């Protein structure tokens, strides 16, 4: 249950930031000595709560969905990925033409979009593409911006390799994406250049 | 990655209730037509946020911790289990004498306490015991109250059996607890009586 626990640790870490923020915000509201910050506290509760909703709507499909056969609308996927990009620096350029997407496609695309975002820790553009053609659905996310970089744990996860030294959270997501694309019969590919990275997957459709 | 995804689905489902509540609460604050409920809305945001913190502090150790060697204080565990019992009907009677507990003991006890609570869907007492003796640490939770009941999915999970028809959320927790107690070298036992159930585990210590 080592894999499962690492994924749970990931989820907990992402949710804990905005949840702590709400708590803090409300502590400030009640503290008779911080009345100078009432409005910033109230804004922080509102925004954190929105951040949490966005992260939970996303995590339910990206991580929580089952292997079971089910189509999603790509517009709804755009919406989930847009929600997660709202709370980090890079911008999202979603280019999948609206259409229904099978379940591996859908779990795959959401994960790919976020790995692309977290490859851009000083901003940039994550361009998301996805075409149904030739008995497949083929996804590619291009991340572009300063110091764009797939960390080593991400790359080892995307190849299904154990985690060496590097962070569990980035890894578990990448390995999870690898395992689900392999169980589906497809393949992961990566490109790395100067100020750029891209992550690609195909799956049968 | 089927097991991992089910655990993620569990986590998401538990967190989504109070997070939606906060969102709703704040929608009521802003809605110029529900000003009649301003105080109940504000109370609901405060309480939901507290519920979330309690669930996240608990989930980080119950689910998120690694197999890696690490002691916890039982008082701190009491605190985590108390937090989760705050948001359901049954009451908790923690009887572990304060002492350090190894990692399998600790993941085990937290899970056992909550399974005991969710066995009491119309209230009652979950009594939690835990003794270090004879090269072991041995935990038992007794749930007592009307219609106390280990559901079939819980029992199949506690034995490591696949999930048949029954709910994924109760199951995944029980299987996760089984896998971690087995990887540690210990065993799970269950008792079932009228208006009572108990779940027990030992692990080497
Ligand atoms: Mg996440
Ligand atoms: Mg939970
Ligand atoms: Ni577009
Ligand atoms: Ni006590």
Author numbering:
A (entry chain A), B (entry chain A): 21 to 225
From the paper:
ChpT does not belong to any class of known HPTs. Its N-terminal histidine 33 (His33) is the residue that shuttles the phosphate, while the C-terminus weakly resembles an ATP-binding domain.
There are three His6-ChpT subunits in the asymmetric unit of the crystal, corresponding to a Matthews coefficient of 3.3 Å3 Da−1 and an estimated solvent content of 62.8%. Two subunits form a homodimer, while the third subunit exploits a twofold symmetry axis of the lattice to generate a similar homodimer but with exact twofold symmetry. A fluorescence spectrum measured on the BM30 beamline allowed us to show that the only metal ions present in the cooled sample were nickel ions, which are presumably derived from the purification procedure. Each subunit consists of two distinct domains, an N-terminal helical hairpin domain and a C-terminal α/β domain, which are connected by a short linker (residues 84–91). The dimer interface is exclusively between the two helical hairpin domains and the twofold symmetry axis runs parallel to the helices such that the N-termini are adjacent, forming a four-helix bundle referred to as the dimerization and phosphotransfer (DHp) domain. The DHp domain contains the two H-boxes, with each catalytic His33 located on an opposite face of the four-helix bundle. In His6-ChpT the ATP lid is substituted by two additional turns in the N-­terminal part of helix α5. These turns occupy the space in which the β- and γ-phosphates are usually located in the CA domain of HKs. Also, there is an additional short α-­helix (α4′) between strand β5 and helix α5 in ChpT, which together with the latter helix closes the ATP-binding pocket found in the CA domain of HKs.
